[PDB]
Design a binder for this molecule. Structure first.
Ligand code: BEF
Ligand SMILES: [Mg+2]
Lengths: 128, 14
């Protein structure tokens, strides 16, 4: 996948966003912006050019599942890769992610190696 | 059930 792919990292906890941005940087992905919930995310996305979303599940105003469904049903953004992040792997939450079109699913905390594994899975499926 | 979670994740390509 292109090193200059533009990521949006979405989490209501600024420290978690910083950590994810830093892991991306460690992998060579320097083109990264941040959003603090699903509403903030959609605002940022209007600027265009975004190529990959990493979103937390639990956020105020619009949560990660709500954001994912919105992106997937959007006329312009429907095929954007979205990696969902959760605090705990549960059947119900995984199946919810699957039904909504999550490109990937990862439990926090995760290492740069795990992030790379999940990104590569998504890139492979999408032919990126 | 943890095995069911791992199977589920694998089946989804997650
Ligand atoms: F708030 Be996220 F689901 F960790
Ligand atoms: Mg959160």
């Amino acid at each position: 996948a292109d090193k200059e792919l533009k990521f949006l990292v979405v989490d209501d906890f600024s420290t978690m966003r910083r950590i994810v941005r830093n892991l991306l940087k460690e992998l060579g992905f320097n083109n990264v912006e941040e959003a603090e919930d699903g509403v903030d995310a959609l605002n940022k996305l209007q600027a265009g050019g975004f190529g990959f979303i990493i979103s937390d599940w639990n956020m105020p105003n619009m949560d990660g599942l709500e954001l994912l469904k919105t992106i997937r049903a959007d006329s312009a953004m429907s095929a954007l890769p979205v990696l969902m992040v959760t605090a705990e792997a549960k059947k119900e939450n995984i199946i919810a992610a699957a039904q909504a079109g999550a490109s990937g699913y990862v439990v926090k905390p995760f290492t740069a190696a795990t992030l790379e594994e999940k990104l590569n899975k998504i890139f492979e499926k999408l032919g990126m | 059930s943890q095995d069911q979670v791992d199977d589920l994740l694998d089946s989804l390509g997650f």
